[PDB]
């Protein structure tokens, strides 16, 4: 009998969503000129990982980047000169995510091992060692990202996100609500809100302070793999196994535009925006990335450079570069 | 500025030395994914051979790391994709259950036709054969009730039954093996193959079996790349 009012209230919510929908992001945007024909080529190709890369994260200085590979390596690259800076050997070789702290002092990584390891890069001695291991999740960690040096947000395969105070080591907050594996995590520029996409084809917005989900977004047809806020933080984009990306705005609480093609039939693995938010970059399972005009939903370019599955994709804060890591163990920088 | 660049190049050299030193080690060992149900005796086999339960066994100067994934939740659609590069999947089945056997077949079928898990060979162990023989002799539970097609199955001429084994036990055994191999050969495309084995809980010759299957897998990989097979 409870499902009855649940269902009717969902109907009321859907009716409100339909009422709030007057115009789509297709007629309003059609008036502006098309973005063009963006062609990019590999400025730098970083080589050194033995196995396939899963994740990577730029620095805030747009210089350095960490990358995680299944041989158990967390390798920091200097992007301009292709030199390595650090090569950290992991306790567990099944790392599915990594983060580079915004202050640049710390790196995080975790995966099937169920623990998020945090490493400091600027010890007095000089070497890089285990700063602290955070445990408490009962599933693989799909993503982790830093609020600051002393507070990190993680998302696990046990349908839960966790906000950790690093000094004490305990999960300050436990965000619950998702039905399936939480696969991706993206944080707002204000570091007060963050969206998380899971396998139940749902993305949930969380307030870090409140500890309870503020809004929920559905519209996909399969598992969500990647998610990313629009640069201003009033929207975000998600990629799934549907071979479709979608853009959701927080205030409108409704899907705005979907990016999909008849030809494309493989799922999205990674999604990132540009500095301006005009170009949405999505890595697909067909071994190459596609660049969409985020406004007109056209296909603006193609980063066809990788031999295997494109796993991770990221864009510098400066906006000068795009890193793409794939399952053929090669990082590529595009411009 | 020259000093900084020289120091950076020195650091990159000292790092690349370590990666060169570790690449040999990484290429030497072979990684194996151990899958099986709770009922299936994968725990006992890994215990006899010896979050994520990693074990390592060394035979004939070759090292294998078996990675039983135990800490995760029921769903495996996403964590499985981590094992595209393993040499083999060791898939263990409790063959004396008769009720959770179609579960095993469904899982094997899902593994076989996975896009990422394709081109991966499966070494299939059919554990608890003692219990299956005891059950078939007992005759309390009839297999046909669970698998109708077994009412017309015939033991094939290529079968090699153990001495002093009743024809009933052989017939049931090879029925189960054929149930798996139908799925295996339905869509293989020659990239990967299934290697079925008949093992007991008091069997101590498993490690050599995995070594033999891994050698065969790597031999086939080399032969196909040289286009000799």
């Amino acid at each position, epitope marked *: 009998q409870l499902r009855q009012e649940a269902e009717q209230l969902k109907n009321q919510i859907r009716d409100a969503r339909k009422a709030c929908a007057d115009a789509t992001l297709s007629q309003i945007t059609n008036n502006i000129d098309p973005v063009g024909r963006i062609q990019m080529r590999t400025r730098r190709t970083l080589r050194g990982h033995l196995a396939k890369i899963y994740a990577m994260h730029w620095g805030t200085d747009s210089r350095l980047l960490v990358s995680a590979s299944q041989d158990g390596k967390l390798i920091i690259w200097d992007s301009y000169t292709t030199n390595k800076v650090h090569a950290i050997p992991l306790r567990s070789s099944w790392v599915m995510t990594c983060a580079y702290a915004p202050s640049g002092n710390y790196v995080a990584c975790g995966g099937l091992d169920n623990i998020c390891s945090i490493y400091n890069l600027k010890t007095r001695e000089g070497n890089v060692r285990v700063s602290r291991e955070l445990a408490g999740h009962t599933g693989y960690l799909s993503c982790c990202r830093f609020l600051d040096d002393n507070q990190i947000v993680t998302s696990s395969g046990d349908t839960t996100c966790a906000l950790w105070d690093i000094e004490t080591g305990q999960q300050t907050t436990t965000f619950t609500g998702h039905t399936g594996d939480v696969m991706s995590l993206s944080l707002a520029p204000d570091t007060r809100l963050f969206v998380s996409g899971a396998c139940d084809a749902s993305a949930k917005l969380w307030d870090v302070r409140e500890g309870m989900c503020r809004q929920t977004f559905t519209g996909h047809e399969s598992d969500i793999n990647a998610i990313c806020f629009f640069p201003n933080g009033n929207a975000f984009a998600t990629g799934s196994d549907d071979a479709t990306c979608r853009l959701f705005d927080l205030r409108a609480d409704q899907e705005l535009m979907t990016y999909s093609h008849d030809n494309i039939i493989c799922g999205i693995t990674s999604v990132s925006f540009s500095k301006s938010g005009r170009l949405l970059l999505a890595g697909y399972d067909d071994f190459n990335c596609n660049v969409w005009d985020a406004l007109k939903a056209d296909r603006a370019g193609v980063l066809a450079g990788h031999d295997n599955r494109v796993s991770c994709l990221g864009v510098t804060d400066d906006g000068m570069a795009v890193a793409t890591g794939s399952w053929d163990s090669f990082l590529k920088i595009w411009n | 500025q020259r000093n900084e660049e020289k120091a950076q190049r020195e650091a990159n050299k000292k790092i690349e030395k370590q990666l060169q030193k570790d690449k040999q080690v990484y290429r030497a060992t072979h990684r194996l994914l151990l899958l099986g149900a709770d009922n299936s005796g994968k725990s006992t086999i890994v215990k006899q051979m010896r979050g994520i339960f990693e074990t390592k066994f060394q035979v004939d100067k070759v090292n294998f790391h078996m990675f039983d994934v135990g800490g995760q939740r029921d769903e495996r659609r996403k964590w499985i994709q981590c094992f595209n590069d393993v040499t083999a999947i060791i898939f263990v089945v409790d063959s004396s259950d008769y009720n959770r056997l179609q579960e095993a077949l469904n899982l094997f079928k899902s593994i076989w036709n996975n896009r990422w898990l394709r081109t991966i060979s499966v070494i299939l162990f059919l554990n608890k054969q003692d219990l299956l023989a005891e059950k078939v002799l007992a005759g309390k539970s009839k297999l046909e009730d*669970y698998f109708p097609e077994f009412a017309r199955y015939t033991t094939p001429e290529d079968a090699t039954p153990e001495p002093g084994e009743d024809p009933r036990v052989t017939r049931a055994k090879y029925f189960i093996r054929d149930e798996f191999l139908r799925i295996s050969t339905a869509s293989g495309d020659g990239r990967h193959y299934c290697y079925p084995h008949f093992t007991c809980a008091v069997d101590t010759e498993n490690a050599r079996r995995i070594f033999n299957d891994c050698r065969d897998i790597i031999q086939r990989m080399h032969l196909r790349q040289y286009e000799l097979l």
Partner: nanobody, 126 residues
Framework: QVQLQESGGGLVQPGGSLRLSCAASGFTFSNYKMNWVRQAPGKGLEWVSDISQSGASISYTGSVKGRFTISRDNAKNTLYLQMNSLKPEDTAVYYC?????????????????????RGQGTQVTV
């Protein structure tokens, strides 16, 4: 969103007949292999049948083979299971399930305890 709604079933005497229906919404029904599973009272989730995208390849669990018929109609986006000659080990809650991803012929986690793409199911008792 992805919504699977089951219908049909009830109390039928042994040797009777039933027709289980599944209405799908929120996804392209034509592109996913669809399954039927059952939850027996006090037992675990058991896969019962599956049918491929176009219905070319249909499969059943050995127990129910020969008396259940699976089908799908993509015009009205519906899945059907015809139940014939019921016996009192067939009583269960029947769940319609959708395969995790499109354009695939493997289907993982369909019998998982908290799968995300199954309906509420219907009680079929005899």
């Amino acid at each position: 969103q992805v919504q699977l709604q089951e219908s049909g079933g009830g109390l039928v005497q042994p040797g009777g007949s039933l027709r289980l229906s599944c209405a799908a919404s929120g996804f392209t029904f034509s592109n996913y292999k669809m399954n039927w599973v059952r939850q027996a009272p006090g037992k675990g989730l058991e896969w019962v049948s599956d049918i491929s995208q176009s219905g070319a390849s249909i499969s059943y669990t050995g127990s129910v083979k020969g008396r259940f018929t699976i089908s799908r109609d993509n015009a009205k986006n519906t899945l059907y299971l015809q139940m014939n000659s019921l016996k009192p080990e067939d009583t269960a809650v029947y769940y319609c399930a959708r395969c995790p991803a499109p354009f695939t012929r493997d289907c993982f986690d369909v019998t998982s305890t908290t799968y995300a793409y199954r309906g509420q199911g219907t009680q079929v008792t005899v």
